[PDB]
Amino acid sequence: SLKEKFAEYEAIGPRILELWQAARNAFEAGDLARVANLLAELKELFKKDLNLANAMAAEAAEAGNKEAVALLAEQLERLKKIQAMFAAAVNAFRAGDREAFGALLEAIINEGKALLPLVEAIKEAI
Ligand SMILES: O=[N+]([O-])c1ccc2[nH]nnc2c1
Ligand SMILES: O=[N+]([O-])c1ccc2[nH]nnc2c1
Ligand SMILES: O=[N+]([O-])c1ccc2[nH]nnc2c1
Ligand SMILES: C[As](C)(=O)[O-]
Ligand SMILES: [Zn+2]
């Protein structure tokens, strides 16, 4: 059910954000092994997050819950942006482009931080 799905979703976002912060700490220290591991952990979690968000959006539409549909639409649009910067960042990390990678990590984290209040609103709205 929707609250069931949201209950699963609620805990994913902060685990993802913790990994991005861990990736930036590792990168700034030169620990390139660990950055790669973290990026690989993030691929699987971020895929789960997006699958769950899309599932919640579809269920909120089925229920005719206008304001959850709108909040989930914002969430999905922001996640799609992070997804593209993530793809860009892995490509930059593999190319050895430190300027591109550091810039994208910073931007990704800034986007992720902004999702926590939106998840809070989604909880109220469902
Ligand atoms: O990718 N992220 O950085 C990130 C941050 C917060 C989130 N909340 N829900 N999913 C999330 C993903
Ligand atoms: O981005 N937000 O954190 C956030 C929170 C509550 C909202 N209500 N409407 N748009 C919203 C966006
Ligand atoms: O309870 N709500 O349905 C609801 C709707 C829009 C919101 N924006 N921020 N928090 C919100 C809660
Ligand atoms: C109805 As609204 C998009 O201000 O939460
Ligand atoms: Zn239907």
Ligand SMILES: [Zn+2]
């Ligand atoms: Zn809004």
Ligand SMILES: [Zn+2]
């Ligand atoms: Zn609210």
Ligand SMILES: [Zn+2]
């Ligand atoms: Zn609102």
